[PDB]
Design a protein around this ligand. Structure first.
Ligand code: HEO
Ligand SMILES: COC1=C(OC)C(=O)C(C/C=C(/C)CC/C=C(/C)CC/C=C(\C)CC/C=C(/C)CC/C=C(/C)CC/C=C(/C)CC/C=C(\C)CCC=C(C)C)=C(C)C1=O
Ligand SMILES: CCCCCCCCCCCCCCCCCC(=O)OC[C@H](COP(=O)(O)OCCN)OC(=O)CCCCCCCCCCCCCCCCC
Ligand SMILES: CCCCCCCCCCCCCCCCCC(=O)OC[C@H](COP(=O)(O)OCCN)OC(=O)CCCCCCCCCCCCCCCCC
Ligand code: HEM
Ligand SMILES: [Cu+2]
Lengths: 184, 99, 262, 658
């Protein structure tokens, strides 16, 4: 039964790797499409990008503790370590929408250049993936608390372990190709 | 399959010495841009590698082997669609200037 | 797979004549593995069909080597010589590569407007729509661009084609070895009225006949001497007939591209 | 309703599009009448629509393709007539506003909806049967995939009814598809029909990958699988890897058409060459998603009707695997004329000829499966002998386009058109018709009529060479794709011969309908009982005529390559076991049509700018999905009594005719 879905979800994650790859090529070309607008060094508040990363690097260790607790059959600890993970992902999403709001209400929106478009669609897509992961983790804690740690909810914790840790793997390529390699 | 509390807290105490060093070099300025770009990219592959090794626990013994195989094949499709597209659109942009 | 008096199999240009001898080389480098493959599909389906009790029936014969290695080396020994030929011709028929000749190229700047072509002569100063002219046995320098959706400048009887994008200068080099009036078209769909982007490349027999064509071109009340006159020749129209303008603004082709780049 | 929707969007004064949308609204309602009269609405909800069963989903995938092969062909036979009228004086009957919606809605349909769910329709019906599995790895994801293919049909079959379709070509290009040169909702119908059908076909490429990998019988190694399963495995690595390039190249166009971004415009940073690059980075790999499962349909028809083991099994597998990886480094041969250098044109022009060596070795392996055999001339083998002749020419003229020196004069022109019709009509379409008549006894129980299947081949292959060889002599005369007005009268005599060939194809589609009708009527005489009508070799011929809902009562124990022709050769075929065990089958789920029905609302609202409705549709797609996870009843145990009954019926049918 299980394990076949985890492998299918890993294959979906590979398709997702390629999806994000297409967005890293569109940004690699349109990074200098900054016609009369703001270049990379001008809008990237680098400290604000660091605090995001540490809100997502904690979002992987706090889930790892949830997986360890699930392997220890400690449902209460699973909920406690999943509720804390949803609190760092929520902070990352809050800072992401705050950045996308500081950019839009100052004219530097997605329709200003080819750069900001290639920047709002690459970081914005990662934000959409993270918020989908948050919707998934919230609709999963409802099932862990309701039923328990049944054979169908142990797969969803491991199917989310791949998805949630992978979002922090893409981010290692996001702050180093968009923010670091841009504000350099 | 399973990851101990030592698999974590060793990919977490190592991923902070890889999310600070580039975020410090490229921030305060410590070397020539030819070495900064190499550091923030060599440490950007080592961190992804340590994540794949200790967060999405990825051995060769999973799924009869089709767990590292699918990834290694997917990297070959990214390195072909990215390096290919960048090469093409560098040859296309140059050949359409005001020569 | 036919046409003895067609365009591509009877070109009148050097860029076109060296591509015909390239199509006829590939067509013949592949009839070595296609004429057998089509002859074998018919000769094997007949000799061994169901009722021919005169052949060998061996339903235990999959792995061979004399028939597996010689069948996986003729495609290779063909593609190899079809690959070095590809490389040599590609590095010789490139659009950007200037033609070798002891005569200065006549630069023509091609703006693909909305369902009409616009040819600027920056040296003579004339700028005609839906018609070019250049002496035979004389290279030309097409600097093709677009004012609208992506078109494709194509003169089938003279040689290659090159796309045309809004802010972008793509270069093409053609030459007419014989005089005449060669048809031109747009080789990429461009919208409702794309079927009317049809110009005529009048190749003059000598230079004296080309100067007298510029003469009749520089004898018109029209005048393309401002950008507000170019934007007048941009109202979406179809089947634009030949129209000769007059003294043109210097660096006009550079002003068309320098509006999708600001 | 709200948004841009209004009666000024339905074509009322246009005569042609008024009869059509009054015929489909008449046919689609006569269908409801026929269904409700016979009372077959409950049976068409508990058995077919809400069905997690690869057999009943691989028949509903094909019914869509067949019922839209007619919708896509009427686009052809009309733009074949306009070019025959516009070439000699008369203006015609299709103004350039209504013709440009024809060659667009004909490439979008006959690729994504007549060729894609006909290749997937066979990879669904037969692949779970060959490997010895009782169902795909993810049953519910298969019903949802199908209903996400239909959700892209209710958006293209409605585009001619309310609004218009794209006027840009089947791969709508950036500067012409932007909101400044195509502002009407014709590209939004092109966007949300390929997007809501790409999300659905990516999930069906993950099914058959995991199915072929981790659902095989106990003993079928990766080098004992059937060649159709191997090709359907290599054609899903091209779905998982390439279709993500489509869900972005389209999604980047929506933002360019909705939020006013500057991805693909020509001003303020946008490169309108990045779309032409990405859409072909997917475009090419997508043409090997269609031709690889057809390289399997023909690998088993030749090895079956010739009564001979497939020549060089281990050389056909190392050709499909090559083509699977060699199809990602060739995608630039579609815009050789764009203006790239001489080192990238020539590089992408060599790697697209190296991909012809595996295809040649594949074509030559089939020639030696027929070398020393007994080639039964059943209509399914008639296509294969015709597929070789109709695909060698296509490949020959396509490698001649792979030369970027001969691709400058043979770019978009009536020489390009007839190559991807030579390799599709001679390829995919022949394979989609050779695999439809070869597995028809395994999908319904009776055998297709033969004296009409033969007449359906001699009009499709004769009506091709007399309908596209004229479109081969026109590329050398200097014609262009997508011409519909005032065609130079020099192209006349070649466009009338090319029109009198689509009439023979139409007669070859009428023959298909007559064949289906006669075979469905006279089923009680052309009936297949033993489950092995042709003398097959793979495991799908070990079942009954229609294999039961569970494929195999006991999962077969494979020991050799031809898993069934090896059991049937040694005698261990049709043997009855001692004790059956209850099967663990999935449960028919009706939450896949609802996620899809809630997706047409989202698409039809994002097209017509109905935001209050797009929000509701999007929520309904992620509310029927949240509540589907709380459904803790998704499987049931098929008891041993029903298995005993079915197996005893089958063994009775066998032993009474031995
Ligand atoms: C089923 C789909 C399909 C298939 C299988 C093919 C097969 C091939 N196609 Fe075609 N194509 C397909 C569908 C399309 N092609 C297109 C366009 C297109 C273009 C663009 C040209 C231009 O820029 O306009 C090129 C260069 C090719 C080349 C090829 C090649 C090299 C193959 C090779 O696979 C063919 C190899 C087969 C051969 C060679 C076997 C026969 C020969 C034998 C017996 C082997 C012996 C060995 C040698 C001869 C090498 N195709 C388009 C454009 C869409 C649009 O814009 O309209 C489509 C849809
Ligand atoms: C905007 O313009 C457009 C259209 O306008 C027409 C479209 O239709 C379409 C397609 C939409 C559709 C609803 C068309 C789909 C339906 C069809 C039939 C497609 C056309 C098919 C063909 C040309 C091939 C033939 C296919 C068939 C299924 C034939 C149907 C079956 C039969 C028996 C037709 C009979 C025709 C005959 C000439 C023989 C009949 C003669 C007799 C029975 C003799 C006795 C006479 C009587 C009256 C009893 C598009 C996409 C479009 O863009
Ligand atoms: C913008 C459009 C995006 C479209 C959808 C994304 C938005 C919301 C994402 C989905 C909603 C949140 C998560 C789903 C809700 C509950 C899912 C769940 O129950 O998880 C358990 C399930 C485990 O599998 P199982 O339990 O067996 O499934 C049976 C029934 N589902 O888990 C599963 O195996 C299935 C769940 C997989 C999660 C997929 C999430 C993908 C995120 C995609 C973001 C889109 C980004 C846009 C890209 C375009 C490019 C510009
Ligand atoms: C950019 C597009 C924008 C368009 C708007 C957004 C569209 C979303 C609206 C549609 C909702 C998404 C599809 C809903 C179903 C998702 C698939 C699913 O439910 O997974 C089920 C599968 C297990 O199901 P199974 O084992 O077969 O048995 C059934 C037991 N419940 O679980 C598995 O085994 C895992 C295998 C697949 C994992 C999830 C599949 C894809 C994830 C969601 C797709 C979201 C689409 C976004 C981008 C598309 C690319 C895929
Ligand atoms: C049934 C016989 C068919 C006929 C008569 C036919 C006819 C045509 C015609 C006339 C065109 C446009 C020619 C032009 O652009 O000038 C065309 C384009 C096309 N056809 Fe077909 N076709 C047929 C079958 C198919 C099949 C089977 C497929 C794929 C499965 C297919 C896919 C396409 C595509 C992708 C285009 C490109 C449309 C565009 O330019 O946007 N066709 N067809
Ligand atoms: Cu291709």
């Amino acid at each position: 039964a299980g394990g076949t879905k985890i492998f299918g979800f890993w294959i979906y994650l590979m398709s997702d790797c390629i999806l994000f790859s297409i967005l890293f090529a569109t940004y690699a070309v349109l990074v200098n499409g900054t016609a009369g607008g703001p270049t990379g060094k001008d809008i990237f508040e680098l400290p604000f990008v660091l605090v995001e990363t540490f809100l997502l690097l904690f979002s992987s260790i706090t889930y790892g503790m949830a997986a360890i607790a699930m392997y220890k059959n400690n449902k209460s600890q699973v909920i406690s370590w999943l509720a804390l993970t949803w609190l760092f992902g929520a902070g990352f999403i809050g800072m992401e929408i705050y950045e996308f709001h500081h950019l839009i209400v100052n004219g530097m929106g997605p329709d200003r250049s080819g750069f900001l478009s290639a920047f709002f669609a690459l970081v914005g897509t990662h934000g959409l993936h993270v918020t989908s992961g948050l919707i998934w983790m919230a609709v999963l804690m409802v099932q862990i608390a309701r039923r328990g740690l049944t054979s169908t909810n142990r797969t969803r914790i491991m199917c989310l372990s791949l998805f949630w840790h992978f979002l922090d793997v893409v981010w290692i390529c996001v702050f180093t190709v968009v923010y670091l390699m841009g504000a350099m | 399959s399973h990851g101990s509390v030592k698999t974590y807290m060793t990919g977490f105490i190592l991923s902070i010495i890889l999310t600070v060093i580039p975020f410090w070099m490229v921030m305060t300025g410590a070397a020539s841009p030819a070495v900064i770009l190499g550091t923030i990219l060599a440490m950007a592959v080592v961190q992804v590698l340590v994540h794949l090794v200790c967060f999405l626990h990825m051995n060769t013994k999973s799924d009869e082997g089709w767990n590292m195989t699918a990834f290694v094949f997917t990297v070959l499709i990214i390195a072909i669609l990215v390096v290919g597209s960048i090469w093409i659109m560098w040859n296309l942009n140059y050949n359409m200037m005001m020569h | 797979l036919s046409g003895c008096n067609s365009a591509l199999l009877d070109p009148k240009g050097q860029i076109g004549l060296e591509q015909r001898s390239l199509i006829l080389t590939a067509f013949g480098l592949m009839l070595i593995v296609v004429i057998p493959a089509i002859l074998m599909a018919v000769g094997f389906a007949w000799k061994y069909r169901a009722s021919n009790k005169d052949a060998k029936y061996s339903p235990n014969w999959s792995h061979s080597n004399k028939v597996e290695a010689v069948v996986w080396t003729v495609p290779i020994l063909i593609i190899i010589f079809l690959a070095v030929l590809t490389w040599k011709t590609t590095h010789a028929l490139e659009p950007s590569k200037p033609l070798a000749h002891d005569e200065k190229p006549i630069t023509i700047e091609v703006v693909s407007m909305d369902w009409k072509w616009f040819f600027i002569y920056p040296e003579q100063g004339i700028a005609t729509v839906n018609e070019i002219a250049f002496p035979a046995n004389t290279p030309v320098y097409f600097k093709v661009t677009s004012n609208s959706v992506m078109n494709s400048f194509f003169i089938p009887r003279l040689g290659s084609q090159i796309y045309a994008m809004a802010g972008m200068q793509t270069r093409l080099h053609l030459i007419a070895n014989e005089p005449g009036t060669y048809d031109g078209i747009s080789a990429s769909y461009s919208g409702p009225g794309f079927s009317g982007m049809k110009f005529k490349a009048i190749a003059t027999p000598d230079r004296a006949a080309f100067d007298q064509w510029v003469a009749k071109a520089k004898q018109s009340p029209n005048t393309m001497s401002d950008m507000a006159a170019f934007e007048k020749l941009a109202a979406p129209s179809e089947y634009n007939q030949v129209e000769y303008f007059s003294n043109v603004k210097p660096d006009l082709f550079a002003d068309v591209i320098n509006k999708f780049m600001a | 309703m709200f948004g841009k929707l209004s009666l000024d969007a339905v074509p009322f004064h246009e005569p042609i599009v008024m009869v059509t949308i009054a015929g489909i609204i008449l046919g689609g309602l006569a269908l409801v009448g026929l269904i409700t009269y016979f009372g077959k609405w409950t049976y068409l909800w508990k058995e077919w629509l809400t069905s997690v069963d690869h057999k009943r989903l691989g028949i509903m995938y094909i019914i869509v393709a067949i019922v839209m092969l007619l919708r896509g062909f009427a686009d052809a036979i009309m733009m074949r007539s306009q070019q025959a009228l516009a070439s000699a004086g008369e203006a015609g009957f299709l103004p350039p506003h209504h013709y440009d919606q024809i060659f667009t809605a004909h490439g979008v349909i006959m690729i994504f909806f007549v060729a894609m769910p006909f290749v997937i329709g066979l990879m669904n019906l037969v692949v779970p049967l060959q490997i010895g599995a009782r169902d795909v790895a993810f049953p519910f994801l298969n019903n949802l995939s199908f209903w996400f293919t239909v959700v892209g049909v209710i958006l293209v079959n409605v585009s001619l009814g309310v609004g218009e379709f794209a006027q840009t070509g089947w791969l709508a290009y950036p500067p012409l598809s932007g909101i400044e040169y195509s502002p009407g909702v014709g590209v939004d119908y092109w966007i949300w029909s390929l997007q809501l059908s790409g999300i659905g076909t990516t999930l069906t490429g993950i099914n058959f990958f995991v199915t072929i990998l981790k659902m095989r019988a106990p003993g079928m190694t990766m080098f004992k699988m059937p060649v159709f399963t191997w090709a359907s495995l290599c054609a899903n690595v091209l779905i998982i890897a390439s279709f993500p390039i489509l869900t972005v190249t389209v999604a980047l166009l929506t933002l360019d058409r909705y939020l006013g971004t500057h991805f693909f415009t020509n001003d303020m940073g946008g490169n309108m060459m990045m779309y032409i690059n990405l859409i072909w980075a997917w475009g090419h790999p997508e043409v090997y998603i269609l031709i690889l499962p057809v390289f399997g349909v023909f690998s088993e028809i030749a090895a079956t009707f010739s009564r001979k083991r497939l020549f060089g099994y281990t050389s056909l597998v190392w050709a499909t695997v090559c083509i699977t990886v060699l199809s990602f480094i060739v995608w630039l041969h579609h815009f050789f004329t764009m203006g790239a250098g001489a080192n990238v044109n020539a590089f992408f022009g060599i790697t697209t000829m190296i991909i012809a060596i595996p295809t040649g070795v594949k074509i030559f392996n089939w020639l030696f499966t027929m070398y020393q055999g007994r080639i039964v001339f059943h209509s399914a083998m008639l296509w294969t002998i015709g597929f070789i002749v109709t695909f060698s020419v296509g490949g020959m003229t396509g490698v001649l386009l792979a030369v970027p020196g001969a691709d400058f004069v043979l770019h978009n022109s009536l020489f390009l058109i007839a190559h991807f019709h030579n390799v599709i009509i001679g390829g995919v379409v022949f394979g989609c018709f050779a695999g439809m008549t070869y597995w028809w006894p395994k999908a319904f129980g009776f055998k297709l009529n033969e004296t009409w299947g033969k007449r359906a081949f001699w009009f499709w292959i004769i009506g091709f060479f007399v309908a596209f060889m004229p479109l081969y002599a026109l590329g050398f005369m200097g014609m262009t794709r997508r011409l519909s007005q005032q065609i130079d009268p020099q192209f006349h005599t070649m466009l009338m011969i090319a029109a009198s060939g689509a009439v023979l194809i139409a007669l070859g589609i009428l023959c298909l309908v007559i064949q289906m009708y006669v075979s469905i009527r006279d089923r009680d005489q052309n009936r297949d009982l033993t489950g092995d009508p042709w003398g097959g070799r793979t495991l799908e011929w070990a079942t009954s005529s229609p294999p039961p809902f569970y494929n195999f009562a006991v999962v077969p124990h494979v020991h050799e390559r031809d898993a069934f022709w090896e059991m049937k050769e040694k005698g261990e075929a049709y043997k009855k076991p001692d004790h059956y065990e209850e099967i663990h089958m999935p449960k028919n789920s009706g939450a896949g049509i609802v996620i899809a029905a809630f997706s047409t609302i989202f698409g039809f609202a994002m097209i017509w700018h109905i935001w209050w409705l797009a929000i509701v549709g999007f929520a309904g797609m992620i509310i029927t999905w949240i509540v589907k996870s709380f459904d803790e009843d998704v499987d049931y145990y098929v008891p041993v009594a029903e298995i005993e009954k079915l197996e005893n019926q089958h063994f009775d049918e066998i032993t009474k005719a031995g």
